[PDB]
Amino acid sequence: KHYITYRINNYTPDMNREDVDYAIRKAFQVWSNVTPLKFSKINTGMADILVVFARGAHGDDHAFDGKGGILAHAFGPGSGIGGDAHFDEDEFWTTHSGGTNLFLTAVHEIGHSLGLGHSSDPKAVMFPTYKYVDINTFRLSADDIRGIQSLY
């Protein structure tokens, strides 16, 4: 199906609540812009993709590892934790270059939420390693486009 819902379960205290909403909205928009996917934000109740901030062990057999290392993870589409995107609260989430940029990380993780694996293109958002790029000139690489359009 092309209609997919999300809910921001909780908000990192690192950031303004409004900035988390915006970063997440823009991350979904990135993928919506290159597919027929329609995303809808839910405030309360059942949603396909939950956006969660948590530290250490947090219920899903994939515990986080403290500051650094693994920044976030996400599960491919399914029931329950399927589709959910988890961000390690031990990171320092930001709208800027400092710490770990939430928008960029969210684009990567939503990619996983939708069923993508990793890319071999070093410029792809789905390359395995986080790298800050200038947010205002950010673009999905042609390989990201191939990946997502193959699924939707």
Ligand SMILES: C[C@H](NC(=O)[C@H](C)NC(=O)[C@H](Cc1cc(-c2ccccc2)no1)CP(=O)(O)c1ccc(Br)cc1)C(N)=O
């Ligand atoms: C501290 C920071 N760490 C990272 O970038 C690390 C390597 N990457 C991760 O934390 C992966 C998550 C990530 C990648 C990106 C990104 C952003 C922009 C461009 C390219 C990539 N954003 O988040 C972890 P994952 O979701 O792939 C994951 C895979 C397997 C398991 Br099991 C669990 C999770 C760094 N190396 O700068």
Ligand SMILES: [Ca+2]
């Ligand atoms: Ca889910």
Ligand SMILES: [Ca+2]
């Ligand atoms: Ca970590």
Ligand SMILES: [Ca+2]
């Ligand atoms: Ca934090």
Ligand SMILES: [Zn+2]
């Ligand atoms: Zn998790």
Ligand SMILES: [Zn+2]
């Ligand atoms: Zn990844």
